[PDB]
Amino acid sequence: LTLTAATTRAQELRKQLNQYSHEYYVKDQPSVEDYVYDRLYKELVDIETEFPDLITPDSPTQRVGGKVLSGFEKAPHDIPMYSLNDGFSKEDIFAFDERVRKAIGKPVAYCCELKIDGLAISLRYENGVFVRGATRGDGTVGENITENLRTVRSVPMRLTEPISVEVRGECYMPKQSFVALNEEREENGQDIFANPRNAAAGSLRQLDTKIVAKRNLNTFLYTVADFGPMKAKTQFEALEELSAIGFRTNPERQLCQSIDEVWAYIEEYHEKRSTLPYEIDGIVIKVNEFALQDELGFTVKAPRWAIAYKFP
Ligand SMILES: CC(C)(C)c1nc(NCCc2c[nH]cn2)c2cc(C(N)=O)c(N)nc2n1
Ligand SMILES: NC(=O)c1ccc[n+]([C@@H]2O[C@H](COP(=O)(O)O)[C@@H](O)[C@H]2O)c1
Numbered sequence: 001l002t003l004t005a006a007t008t009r010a011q012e013l014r015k016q017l018n019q020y021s022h023e024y025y026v027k028d029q030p031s032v033e034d035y036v037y038d039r040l041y042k043e044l045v046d047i048e049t050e051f052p053d054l055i056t057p058d059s060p061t062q063r064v065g066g067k068v069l070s071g072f073e074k075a076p077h078d079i080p081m082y083s084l085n086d087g088f089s090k091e092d093i094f095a096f097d098e099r100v101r102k103a104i105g106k107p108v109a110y111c112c113e114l115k116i117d118g119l120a121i122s123l124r125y126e127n128g129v130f131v132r133g134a135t136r137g138d139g140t141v142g143e144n145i146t147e148n149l150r151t152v153r154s155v156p157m158r159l160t161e162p163i164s165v166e167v168r169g170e171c172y173m174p175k176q177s178f179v180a181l182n183e184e185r186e187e188n189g190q191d192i193f194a195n196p197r198n199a200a201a202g203s204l205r206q207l208d209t210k211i212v213a214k215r216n217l218n219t220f221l222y223t224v225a226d227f228g229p230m231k232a233k234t235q236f237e238a239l240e241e242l243s244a245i246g247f248r249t250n251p252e253r254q255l256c257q258s259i260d261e262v263w264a265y266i267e268e269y270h271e272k273r274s275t276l277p278y279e280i281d282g283i284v285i286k287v288n289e290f291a292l293q294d295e296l297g298f299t300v301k302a303p304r305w306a307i308a309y310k311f312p
Helices: 003-026 035-051 059-062 088-106 175-187 196-203 234-247 258-277 292-295
Strands: 073-075 110-116 119-127 128-137 141-143 166-172 218-224 253-258 280-287 305-309
Touching: 003 059, 003 292, 035 059, 073 128, 088 258, 088 280, 088 305, 110 234, 110 258, 110 305, 119 196, 166 196, 175 196, 218 234, 218 258, 234 292, 253 258, 258 280, 280 292
Parallel strands: none
Antiparallel strands: 073 141, 110 253, 110 280, 119 128, 119 166, 128 141, 166 218, 280 305
């Protein structure tokens, strides 16, 4: 195979393999059998092995990692990553709704989402290319964990549309992976992680990306730092749009027109809790209309337009 032929073929393979990866990791619904992906993946590895200059950032072979950092550079969030206000009872939730109606002056719809137990992350894309991955940190300054996030399979290295946007969401470790990891640590005389949240946080703190690539971390994106590039006008629309551009979103969301529907949602997933492949510590209730979120604003700690109902 000539360099000229390999150059063209490599792009074809990346394109095809990344589409399969999108279906498998982002949609959780593969179209082809694994052996189909494996054969094409092997073909690409052979090409890259022969002509290493053909290796690119969006090549699926880079998911295994390789870089080892000495430490993490600071990662500023010019648009702050606020925290969430907490609610602990049906009372707190209805009180929240009352305060929201009092401020807005009319009934308001809420986009309800599961509160994934993990770590909040921020992903920056420029012209569709993944350029920065960061932890929330203290809200205004986090850690630059770009290299580690390159190994997180559900994180796209190149979006289909060449858009420049910074999306945010949760990075977590599914229950099964958490269990297996702790067994592995027990086998190697290491301290186990107390919970999936800690396992995810500890994994993203590792400096050797090759180790992180093996931690089986996953994601659920739920917001955008700057809605400039995007068209969504409500949170529910934002979730659909995040999915449209290539990110993994949680399918269990629900738009509720009343606080009673909100409470019904909470009860529904409070029972379905144990059945999910990931842990959740509550429900996040968000004023759906962005125009109303803007009107409500933020306290110093968090937005006034959202509240997290924490499971007892
Ligand atoms: C954007 C707001 C403030 C309303 C928000 N903050 C969360 N956490 C605090 C940090 C942060 C700032 N920017 C991105 N994250 C959320 C965590 C979850 C979850 N744990 O699943 C969720 N579904 N939604 C969340 N929504
Ligand atoms: N069927 C598919 O579309 C698809 C896509 C990505 C990974 N996989 C499988 O995931 C596993 C890990 O492969 P990667 O580390 O290359 O992501 C393999 O068993 C592979 O076959 C399958």
